[PDB]
Amino acid sequence: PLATQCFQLSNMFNPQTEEEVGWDTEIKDDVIEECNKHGGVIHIYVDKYSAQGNVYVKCPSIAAAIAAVNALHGRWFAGKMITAAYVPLPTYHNLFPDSMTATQLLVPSRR
C-alpha cells in the first residue's frame, strides 16, 4: 500500500454498544491526543454508523501520516486490536470534500 496524508482506523468501538452521550467526541479526542505525538491532525471523522468502528484521519503531511499509521497499527484500544490503513487522497476527498483545504491543526474538545 502506497503512503498518503490520509488513513482509516478500524475496530475502535462498536456503535451498537456505545450508550454514553458524546462518546464519538471522546473517541475523536483520543485520536487527536495520540496523533499529537506524531505530527498532528487536520481532519477527523468518527463513523457513528459502521459496525467496524471506523475513524477517518487526515494529517498535515505524508510524513506525519506514516509516523501515525506505523505507531497506531496493531495497538490495543479498549481491549481490542486496531488496524490503520492508508486511504488514497481522491477516495478521501470524495468522502470529505471540506478536508481538501483544511490546514489548521485540530485540538481536542476536552482537557
Binding site: 490495543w76 484500544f77 479498549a78
Partner: peptide, 9 residues
C-alpha cells in the same frame, strides 16, 4: 479515562 494500550480482561 484510559483506552489506549488496554488489553482484553
Amino acid at each position: 479515562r484510559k483506552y489506549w494500550d488496554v488489553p482484553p480482561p
